[PDB]
Amino acid sequence: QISVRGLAGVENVTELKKNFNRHLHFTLVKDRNVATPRDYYFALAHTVRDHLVGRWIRTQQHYYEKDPKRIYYLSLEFYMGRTLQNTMVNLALENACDEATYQLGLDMEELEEIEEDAGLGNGGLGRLAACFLDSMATLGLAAYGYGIRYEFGIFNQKICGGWQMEEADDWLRYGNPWEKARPEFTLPVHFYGRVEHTSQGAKWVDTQVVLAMPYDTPVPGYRNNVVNTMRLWSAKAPNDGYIQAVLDRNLAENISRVLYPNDNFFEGKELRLKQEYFVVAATLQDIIRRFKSSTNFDAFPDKVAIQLNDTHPSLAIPELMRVLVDLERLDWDKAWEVTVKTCAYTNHTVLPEALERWPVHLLETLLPRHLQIIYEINQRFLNRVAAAFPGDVDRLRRMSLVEEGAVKRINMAHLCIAGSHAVNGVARIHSEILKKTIFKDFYELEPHKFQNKTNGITPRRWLVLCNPGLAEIIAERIGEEYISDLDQLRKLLSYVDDEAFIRDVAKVKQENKLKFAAYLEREYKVHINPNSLFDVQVKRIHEYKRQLLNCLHVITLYNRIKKEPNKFVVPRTVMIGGKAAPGYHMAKMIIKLITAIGDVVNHDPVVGDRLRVIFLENYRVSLAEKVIPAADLSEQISTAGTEASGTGNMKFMLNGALTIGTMDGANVEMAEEAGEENFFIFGMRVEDVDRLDQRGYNAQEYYDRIPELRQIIEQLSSGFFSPKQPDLFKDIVNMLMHHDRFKVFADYEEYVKCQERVSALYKNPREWTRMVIRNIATSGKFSSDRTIAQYAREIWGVEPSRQRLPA
Amino acid sequence: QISVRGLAGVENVTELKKNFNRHLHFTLVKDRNVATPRDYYFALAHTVRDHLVGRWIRTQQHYYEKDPKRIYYLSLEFYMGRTLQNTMVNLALENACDEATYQLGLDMEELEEIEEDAGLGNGGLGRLAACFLDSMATLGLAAYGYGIRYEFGIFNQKICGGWQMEEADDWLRYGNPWEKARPEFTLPVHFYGRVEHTSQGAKWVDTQVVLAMPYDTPVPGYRNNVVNTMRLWSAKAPNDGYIQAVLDRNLAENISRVLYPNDNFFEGKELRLKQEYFVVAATLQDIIRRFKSSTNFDAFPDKVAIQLNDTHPSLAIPELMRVLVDLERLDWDKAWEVTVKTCAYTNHTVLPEALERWPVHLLETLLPRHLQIIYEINQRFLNRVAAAFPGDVDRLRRMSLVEEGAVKRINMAHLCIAGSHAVNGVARIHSEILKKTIFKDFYELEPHKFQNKTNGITPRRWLVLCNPGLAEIIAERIGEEYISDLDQLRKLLSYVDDEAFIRDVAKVKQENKLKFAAYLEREYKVHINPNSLFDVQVKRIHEYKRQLLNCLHVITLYNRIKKEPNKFVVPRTVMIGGKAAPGYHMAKMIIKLITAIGDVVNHDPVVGDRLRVIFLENYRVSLAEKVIPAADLSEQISTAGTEASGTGNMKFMLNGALTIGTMDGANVEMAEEAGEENFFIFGMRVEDVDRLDQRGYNAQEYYDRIPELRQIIEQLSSGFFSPKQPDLFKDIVNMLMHHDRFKVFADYEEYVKCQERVSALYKNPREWTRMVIRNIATSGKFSSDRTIAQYAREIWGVEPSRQRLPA
Numbered sequence A, B: 001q002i003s004v005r006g007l008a009g010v011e012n013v014t015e016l017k018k019n020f021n022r023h024l025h026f027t028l029v030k031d032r033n034v035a036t037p038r039d040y041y042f043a044l045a046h047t048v049r050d051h052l053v054g055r056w057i058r059t060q061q062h063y064y065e066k067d068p069k070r071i072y073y074l075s076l077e078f079y080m081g082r083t084l085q086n087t088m089v090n091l092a093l094e095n096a097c098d099e100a101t102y103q104l105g106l107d108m109e110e111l112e113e114i115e116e117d118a119g120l121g122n123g124g125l126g127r128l129a130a131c132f133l134d135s136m137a138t139l140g141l142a143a144y145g146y147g148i149r150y151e152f153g154i155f156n157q158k159i160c161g162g163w164q165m166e167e168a169d170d171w172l173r174y175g176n177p178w179e180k181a182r183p184e185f186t187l188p189v190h191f192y193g194r195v196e197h198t199s200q201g202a203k204w205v206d207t208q209v210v211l212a213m214p215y216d217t218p219v220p221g222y223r224n225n226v227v228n229t230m231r232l233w234s235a236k237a238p239n240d241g242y243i244q245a246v247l248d249r250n251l252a253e254n255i256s257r258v259l260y261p262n263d264n265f266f267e268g269k270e271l272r273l274k275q276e277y278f279v280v281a282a283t284l285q286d287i288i289r290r291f292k293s294s295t296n297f298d299a300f301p302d303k304v305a306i307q308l309n310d311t312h313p314s315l316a317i318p319e320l321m322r323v324l325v326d327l328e329r330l331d332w333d334k335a336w337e338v339t340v341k342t343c344a345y346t347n348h349t350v351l352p353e354a355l356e357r358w359p360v361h362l363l364e365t366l367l368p369r370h371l372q373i374i375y376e377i378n379q380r381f382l383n384r385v386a387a388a389f390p391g392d393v394d395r396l397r398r399m400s401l402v403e404e405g406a407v408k409r410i411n412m413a414h415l416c417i418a419g420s421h422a423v424n425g426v427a428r429i430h431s432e433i434l435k436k437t438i439f440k441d442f443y444e445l446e447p448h449k450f451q452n453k454t455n456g457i458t459p460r461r462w463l464v465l466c467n468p469g470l471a472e473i474i475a476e477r478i479g480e481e482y483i484s485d486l487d488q489l490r491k492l493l494s495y496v497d498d499e500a501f502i503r504d505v506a507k508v509k510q511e512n513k514l515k516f517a518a519y520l521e522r523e524y525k526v527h528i529n530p531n532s533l534f535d536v537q538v539k540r541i542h543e544y545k546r547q548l549l550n551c552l553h554v555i556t557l558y559n560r561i562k563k564e565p566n567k568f569v570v571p572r573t574v575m576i577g578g579k580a581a582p583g584y585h586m587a588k589m590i591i592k593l594i595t596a597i598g599d600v601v602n603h604d605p606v607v608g609d610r611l612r613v614i615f616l617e618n619y620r621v622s623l624a625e626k627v628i629p630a631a632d633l634s635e636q637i638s639t640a641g642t643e644a645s646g647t648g649n650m651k652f653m654l655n656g657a658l659t660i661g662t663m664d665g666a667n668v669e670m671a672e673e674a675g676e677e678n679f680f681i682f683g684m685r686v687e688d689v690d691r692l693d694q695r696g697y698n699a700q701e702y703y704d705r706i707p708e709l710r711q712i713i714e715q716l717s718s719g720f721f722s723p724k725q726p727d728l729f730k731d732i733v734n735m736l737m738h739h740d741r742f743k744v745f746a747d748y749e750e751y752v753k754c755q756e757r758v759s760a761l762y763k764n765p766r767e768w769t770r771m772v773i774r775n776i777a778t779s780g781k782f783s784s785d786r787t788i789a790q791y792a793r794e795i796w797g798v799e800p801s802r803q804r805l806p807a
Ligand SMILES: O=c1[nH]c(=O)n([C@@H]2O[C@H](CO)[C@@H](O)[C@H](O)[C@H]2O)cc1F
Pocket: A122, A123, A124, A125, A126, A128, A262, A263, A264, A265, A310, A348, A349, A354, A426, A455, A643, A644, A645, A646, A647, A665
């Protein structure tokens, strides 16, 4: 049907069909008369998977022969989403499978909706890991994703009377056709025990053994016949009341049972620390094993790169020391040189509550050898500080990996900087903040370690896959090469005055909005006007992200309609979606406020279809693939300095939404690429927030001087949005008034005014669309292909390659 | 190579080979250079499984069309063993696969050794279920095995310093290629709650829900293209600290985690009762569902047969009442008629400690509605007794399903008799004992319910599969038809004086003994003379089975050698094997005694290679397939009246071992078939045991009057077999002397003397072999094909059929 979805060869369609029937019969053990759509999805999934394995086997053997440097991406999160369409896209099978299934009398699109998301992550950090693997494979890097195969991913979100309800995400109920269990590569991981000192060194003894069993998932590059591997570890009990002893095996296997659902919040639970060690211990053994199959650890760093996705796998550092010193008997200094040269650290946040700070009493019990190694790392590190800044005792307490207090803690960030040759932030403003604020001391000591690597998203999933209409019209004008070289979108800049392109861009947007409006009605009985502006904020619910600021605007528009009902307003559908961490009380209250606003606004007859507020339930990767292409306005309104980068922002820029946002994270670079005129910037810059903090933030001041704001607060307090529970929202008002760490009132005025400028441009479809084109055309920098090329050249020391392997 | 293993067609071998390579590549994702033997086994297993599915699908559809009466075999145990060779045998693929793998440069036999046993049973009762499914399929019955898919089967037995050690049997570590998960047929099972009474009837409410997910395993008939189904249920938590709530899902799923390892011993644990209800509830829903796809329950019994394998699924009876009365709203009497006409009960033991007697307080909490139904069943039943035997109040307490006492108990056997149209024992002597002793009352009330169905074993696994040499030489003389009509072995009786047959029978036995001797050395470093008589006792360790009697004989031979070293004795290798239930202290002591005897006897230089005592570790189905064909002497020495049938006994008769045994269980019928002259019978009959009990059993009497016995006891007490722990065996001696329920001393004299008659016949190879031939020739009755034909015609009301379905 459409050009970018590849060829439907006569030979190929016939082959796809007969293999589909072979799998329905032999793999699923069904005939055409009893098969349900789920059987059909599985038969297709098994058919497409057959096209991978040849390439998978060839790619792994090719690395064995050429022995290139290997990249190891360690992450507790891999937010993968669905695999089927992504695989078809990267293999050029999409039209072929469309044809093949059509001739069998099936709809491939309704088959794709049966696949469960692999929701093995929380949000941005997890999804960055997924975009990264795709880009690494597309760039021919000999790269491995390593993580935990969680039995339960992020919870499924239900809304009940406006409140979030959590359900276990049982994503493996029906099997996962994409993975291959490799029980033959199972490895022991140790916990507890004690340290013995002998003549020939320290010995870690009397340990509890948990087995790590690997599952391999293929990761295909874009049309280059490279298939890399994501290896995920599962916890298994070793084989040594009888009944009770058998039942208690589930204690050891609980390690890989469930993903922790905090995003941007640290929780010091033991099961979490076990998870962190488990992935690090099993992975390092695998890494070392692979290195020995090609005595001499001097070359280790020329053969191995280990990237740490936040501090979650920070134990990689003392684990590598442990193996090198205790088991391989290298001296301390030589082992330490290998370690630093091997490891690199990526920071994703500056929020203090998000940083991992592990109680010494936990590490002592669980990992007594690792604590000793850490104390020694600390002593030697602090001796370098003392030597470089003599007499500066304050520096020494600030820089210590050990934080003193009523409970002693290890600062895992400090550990990562000390044991890594490179530390990077994820956007230029965020990397600057690291050097000026929380890592200033470390930067002054080792300025060469600090780098920027601005985040990116994959144009395969985030354009070609979710938005075939837009990719198609682009390909008509400029060709197909941009899919793996997103800088070429800049050519689109010569079509900004082209009348036919303007209509085509606007046509695709209208189509996406129609389709999504129909999805809202069918799957959720929700009833929206597709001619309204689609105002969307989707991301995890967190105070720093300021869904509340969005809420206040929404209430302002409603109060403006009620004051002057017969006046023209540009109609909006305001959509807010995201999950709250189960124990984050405020976050849960925010969700309830949003639905409470919808209860009132959506059933007011005076409003009409001019204002709708929808809470988008169970936001996840596969929902983002649907709502992003449908969006007109992208909301990125975090208090300046708090959002390290953002990646949703890039997804929307790429898909023809305009951005309203603060000068925060990657927003700064997007606006710089598109031109500030083509972006709706508002609010405090980082410098302004700083000024407000020195002086003191008094929210009362904004309440006294802004009648429209006062009215909103009065409505919240008086029970206007909760008639049965008049005092339901007193926590929010109290917080907004007395301890708002994120200064929601300070940006309110400039936000509302900036929002009027958006409504104004939207009244002029032609000028709206030309601004869209200028965004899309300059979104090229935000390809994860660019990001990974920079990691490769500036951190890992490997050259990317766009060359095809043969089939 | 050999005729009974089928054709190796040129077309077939070429096809098997290319499918093997397809699975190695696409299913296992390996190339010929990295594959291990386990990969090779899996590729073969996936290839052979492809030949089943066509037939599997056709068989299930054929039943849908013809709508025959369905047989439902309910069992908590299915002792399956390995599936690969059995599948090849039943499909005639064995030579073809042998050729195909050979040409690929593989040894099929070493590939077969990689398959784990499905050890989903304890011993005899579990294995009878497995033989039954094979026979049902071979006889074209529309039959379903229903049970629990245990995550851990019977424990793996390790011997450490002579003591049993238990290891979790993790049989699914590497996957099970034979099963097909059917998550689409998942069903809710209820526990706890309470009973509400309304106007329209009783309602069971506030229940905990556990989900039952089915796994289908194919069961192929012998060369008839029938493939039936064994459906096994797995426990799953429903989807509704967050972390802790997710972790606690393992509480509900524990139901199907582990098989209880007691054989012939009841343990009243709650997890066991949950297991029993779970299989019964999920199965009955499936049964009822299937019946509705073809309102009117009058025809239910013409469409459904439910067989209860012991009392383990006795809850089938009140569950069926519950559904029929509470959910389908039929009146009590009509529902009860349907129930009785549907259900039938098989008893497997008369040992009082083995009978299930469930505390009312457990049933009350766990299954409060079922208890009410049981009380009502009891009341109405006792009214029929009272009416038939007026004034007999004693009968009424004896017959009650409710046993009075300090703790009230439900007698599950009494329930099964009341709710069943047929009750059967498993050998003629056992069925007679039921009518005269423990079920006398019930027999007097309803004499027509009581039947015999003498057990059998499948000649496919138990001859063709494990003993291809013997099957081959039989097929040479009499053809192949006997494999599915074992009565034809009677033709062999005209070869008893044939010189060539005599040499061939003896040749096969020598070959089996050589092979097994080499297995003992390779896998266990054990060092035996293959020219010695192979004296084997293999079965679970239980006092009633009298491994101890065997022990005393062994010690007697040793003391006879030491007394007169230079005298000729027929050399023996005495092999004893079996598992002990983990909490059965005595049973564990017996294992230690056996190895203690081996420690002394095996390293005495005066003994030479004249007497060896070996403990066969980890006895299980796949070990029985090896040792049975190698046996000369089969030991079946249970105290008369205690072994209901036995089935090992039949395995040995079939494979050319002679039997030494008591007139117990099926021993009586075997000796009757072969002629008493061709059997080594000894010891008390049932009548003699009875006489001894009336008088009182005083073991002291045998100790005073038999010097050889006194010497053994003195040796046991003085520490002759335990020099470091002189008093190690005082529990055994104490038991033997003061409270031996099984009268080991009473049979000792006649046992020893009968054992001398065996040594005598063994000195004359020609006459030994002719007696073997007379056993093999009359072992036909003991085919499970005969057994099932009798169940079908006399209990289920269906006609067996030997006719082939088409391929
Ligand atoms: O716990 C975290 N979870 C999370 O998703 N991140 C995000 O990581 C993303 C990837 O770098 C950033 O774009 C984003 O600004 C940042 O909040 C940062 C964390 F620290």
